[PDB]
Amino acid sequence: IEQIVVALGGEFKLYLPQLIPHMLRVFMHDNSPGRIVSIKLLAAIQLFGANLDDYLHLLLPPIVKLFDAPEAPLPSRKAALETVDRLTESLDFTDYASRIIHPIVRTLDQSPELRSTAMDTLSSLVFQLGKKYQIFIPMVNKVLVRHRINHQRYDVLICRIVKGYTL
């Protein structure tokens, strides 16, 4: 699948629907040791690229469900977080602000391992939004003071948005 994707250009859009169901079945029922099939599938979805415009509402929920579950192993959680972080560079994430911000804040607690990766992913979104982020500035701050999370990147953006600049 990876090789076919790299072969075809924008024409790959005409065949993804035939394969979507099989991707959905894998993330749902996976008995592999450590769920390495899911990691490889995420690696491919990273390449999928500027396609997925008409199906981002089908794939996205499962992936999120992966990095909020407490029972799954850490590597898959990191893979999912990095997958979202990479996908943000080409697609649009203005209609799913609440459906990614809430699970991220939930995952922040109960685990200190995914701290840095979680906020690395977070800072990425706040950059595709600008003013559209204002609503959420207070709430997340409450969690930030409790565990004292710091991130130069995330901090600069907040100041610029509050003052009216961007890079």
Partner: protein, 577 residues
């Protein structure tokens, strides 16, 4: 907008060389072949090359008929040099457009060179970007349609910097448009033209409809296909045919997006100074949106933020959806065409904004759309009323409305015979002039005063509108000799005397103020007033119950006396009386 400019000349360089493929490319079996909507393989090379050259000129002429077009098909270095030098010499200090298409030669090189032919058509000769920049003048706009177009922009900027490094021992007014990124290849799908970028830049609606017919959403429309699109009836300039309304809507939507996304200075620079530049940049957004879906990314010299995700595009998809639904009945059963509700709903949203939005919050998004419907006989009245209501909030609203480019539109409606536009135009002009008084000259040069005068002489006009007209006239003539003379030629004195005794007090006050102003530092007006028995009536206001009218009358009398330049004994006697 002081820095006006124009474009006068166009050069069309075409490196087609039909019939032979360069070494770099291996092509599929169907392949994309259309060029300017012509198949080059259904004819002979020379005829195809001439037909393409003519069609390109026609398409460019659709947007700028008053220019000199010169073609250059499969040229050599000397011909290019001669053409560029002659064009620059003829144009002097105006702008010049350069258009390059390289679909028949090898791709550009990292050394800053582009390929041309030799006299025998047996070799490819390099040509340095440095010499091409040398032969062209300072104000210029370049368009590239080739595979690795980004390299050309990068090399151009490098050499522009070098020409400044070597001066310490021309980009300051140059614009560039490119079709690809430095490491990308143009798409070749059999369903698309082989010249996607230029087609987008020059014929937006055709490619827009063809693209819409290829998407997954078309399933919501029954019985619409490419053949029906081929036979859309109408003309691009007839706003009542099916094909002109789409162009109107496209213009409005693109202008709205551009105003909403860009900063003020860049918007003024690119979208309000020159017509051809504005049209090219408006089509640039459609080019970006369309080409993003085939793994391609256009580039520009003054970089712009992304716009493919703006909400207004959704609106576009809706409008087309409706318009194409009527096509079967329209074409087969001769049914009449039904006009779209786009502008009515936009105006409704603009109206909804006003009821609550007094405060200085984010401005409304539909101002440019409102500005696009003033000159239509259907929506003129409602749009004018809404604009008048908007302008009353405060000076900031007036400043914003002037900034968005409202001035030339209102100045053109004064030359109309309709009897219903009078109060609305009076209100708008009063509100505008209350803030900025420099417009007076522009009002007199084009003899707009006539209009207002024809409103002040009607006794059936309500008193408030007459007062506003009097204020407009008073502002026009203040400290402006040309206005003084022009309004005296209209005999404003007699009309001022006629309505000086109306019950409405502020009308009396402003009439007195304008009458006093007209003959300030102007002897002919004073002679007219003396001859027509003006101050004798003016004395009556010296006992008005309202003090402000009294003060205005005193000011008028003082101005009257001041004009007396120690003339003969008759003027002295009148002054002493």
């Amino acid at each position: 907008m002081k820095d006006r400019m124009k474009t006068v000349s166009v050069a069309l360089v075409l490196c087609l060389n039909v019939g032979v493929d360069p070494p770099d490319v291996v092509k599929t079996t169907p392949c994309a072949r259309l060029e300017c909507w012509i198949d080059p393989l259904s004819m002979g090379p020379q005829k195809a090359l001439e037909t393409i050259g003519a069609n390109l000129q026609k398409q460019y002429e659709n947007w700028q008929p008053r220019a000199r077009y010169k073609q250059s098909l499969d040229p050599t270095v000397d011909e290019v040099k001669k053409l560029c030098t002659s064009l620059r010499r003829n144009a002097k200090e105006e702008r010049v457009l350069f258009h390059y298409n390289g679909h028949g030669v090898p791709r550009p090189t990292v050394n800053g060179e582009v390929w041309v032919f030799n006299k025998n058509y047996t070799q490819y000769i390099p040509l340095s970007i440095y010499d091409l920049q040398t032969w062209m003048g300072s104000p210029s706009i370049f368009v590239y349609d080739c595979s690795n177009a980004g390299l050309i922009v990068k090399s151009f900027k490098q050499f522009a910097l070098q020409r400044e490094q070597e001066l310490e021992v021309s980009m300051k007014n140059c614009i560039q448009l490119a079709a690809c990124e430095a490491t990308e290849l143009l798409p070749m799908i059999p369903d698309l033209p082989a010249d996607l970028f230029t087609s987008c830049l020059t014929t937006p609606i055709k490619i827009a409809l063809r693209w819409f017919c290829m998407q997954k959403c078309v399933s919501l429309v029954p019985g619409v296909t490419l053949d029906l699109i081929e036979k859309i009836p109408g003309r691009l300039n007839d706003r009542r045919t099916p094909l002109g309304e789409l162009n109107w809507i496209f213009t409005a939507i693109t202008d709205t997006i551009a105003w909403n996304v860009l900063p003020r200075d860049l918007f003024q620079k690119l979208f309000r100074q020159d017509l051809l530049v504005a049209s090219l940049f408006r089509n640039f957004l459609l080019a970006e949106r369309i080409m993003r879906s085939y793994n391609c990314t256009p580039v520009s010299s003054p970089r712009l933020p992304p716009t493919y995700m703006h909400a207004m595009w959704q609106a576009w998809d809706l409008a087309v959806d409706i318009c194409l639904s009527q096509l079967p009945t329209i074409i087969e059963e001769g049914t009449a065409f039904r006009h779209s509700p786009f502008f009515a709903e936009q105006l409704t949203a603009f109206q909804v904004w006003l009821t609550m939005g007094v405060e200085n919050r984010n401005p409304p998004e539909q101002l440019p759309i409102v500005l696009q419907v003033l000159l239509s006989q259907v929506h003129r009245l409602r749009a004018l009323d809404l604009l008048g209501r908007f302008l009353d909030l405060g000076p900031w609203a007036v400043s914003l409305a002037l900034s968005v480019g409202i001035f030339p539109y209102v100045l053109k409606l004064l030359q109309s015979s309709a009897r219903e536009l009078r109060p609305l135009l009076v209100f708008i002009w009063a509100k505008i002039l209350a803030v900025d008084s420099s417009c007076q000259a522009d009002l007199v040069k084009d003899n707009g005063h006539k209009y207002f005068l024809s409103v002040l002489a009607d006794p059936y006009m309500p008193a408030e509108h007459r007062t506003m007209t009097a204020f407009i006239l008073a502002v026009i003539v203040n400290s402006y000799h040309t206005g003084q003379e022009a309004c005296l030629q209209g005999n404003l004195i007699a009309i001022c005397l006629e309505q000086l005794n109306d019950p409405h007090p502020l009308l009396r006050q402003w009439v007195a103020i304008c009458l006093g102003r007209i003959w300030q530092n102007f002897d002919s007006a004073r002679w007219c007033g003396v001859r027509d028995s003006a101050h004798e009536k003016l004395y009556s206001l010296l006992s008005d119950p309202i003090p402000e009218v009294r003060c205005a009358a005193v000011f008028a009398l003082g101005t009257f006396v001041g004009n007396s330049a120690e003339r003969t004994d008759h003027s002295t006697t009148i002054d002493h009386n």
